[PDB]
Symmetry: C3
Subunit: 89 residues, 3 copies
């Protein structure tokens, strides 16, 4: 009955994103070399995985948030957190 | 309760593999730029983790399926999924 | 229930670190091309995440060990496992 985390990172500084599902909410903590700051991501889910890739200098994050049998993909591409095409059927 | 996912990406397109443990079984959803489709991965498990890595253009995936204390490793290196040499002791 | 794992890789060889939470304790199993051994990492946690990044040849690993609402970051920077600056939202 502990919280459940997921992490990703990029570059050599580095930048780190740590997502934490606690009591059906997933929050984000962010490192870009100067301290941890609470991030923009806030979405429901008891379980969370993450991946990320660079395109040049631009990070792209995909956060998979599952409640029950329902996994929701949240997409960061530098313009906010939008919902992805991800489904499972 | 909730399903438990694990993701990895690679490239800049990118390619994304999203593994989902649901009711004791792990399956795989795949993105390579033109839509999600169900992958060939299909092995038992109540927990999943994943890592990948490129040797040039070739992708290499490692899936750590766990059921109780037993964590099996599944290897994709181009010609299908093979059980890997991982153990815990 | 079932044990829970996290994994990261680096290089072309590659090197793999598979972390495993089992009744409170998180242990590590390491691959560097010549088989699986047991790594130095040993910290308490009911759930673990991990990420890693290269800086030239030097690997850097962050392991997020959670127990209850409390998540602890462990840092590999080629000189051991030190406690990280991460705190929660
Ligand atoms: C990287 C290694 O790849 C395999 C063998 C090759 O070589 C697996 O069997 C090992 O467990 C590990 O995943
Ligand atoms: C500023 O806070 C932006 C920031 O970093 C983004 C990549 C993403 O993690 C966002 O949620 C976060 O708040
Ligand atoms: C829309 O712009 C595509 C988008 O990003 C992909 C990498 C994939 O995550 C897809 O689910 C998402 O909608
Ligand atoms: C030698 O044992 C070092 C080894 O690999 C490190 C990168 C880190 O994973 C450490 O815990 C492990 O023991
Ligand atoms: C140095 O930056 C401190 C250190 O490394 C960061 C990337 C992050 O993991 C931080 O919590 C850790 O203390």
């Amino acid at each position: 009955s502990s919280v459940q985390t997921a992490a990703t990172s990029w570059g050599t500084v580095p930048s780190i994103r740590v997502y934490t599902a606690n009591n059906g909410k997933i929050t984000e903590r962010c490192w870009d070399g100067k301290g941890w700051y609470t991030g923009a991501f806030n979405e429901p889910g008891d379980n969370v995985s993450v991946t990320s890739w660079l395109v040049g200098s631009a990070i792209h994050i995909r956060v998979y948030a599952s409640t029950g049998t329902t996994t929701t993909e949240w997409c960061w591409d530098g313009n906010g957190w939008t919902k992805g095409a991800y489904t499972a059927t």
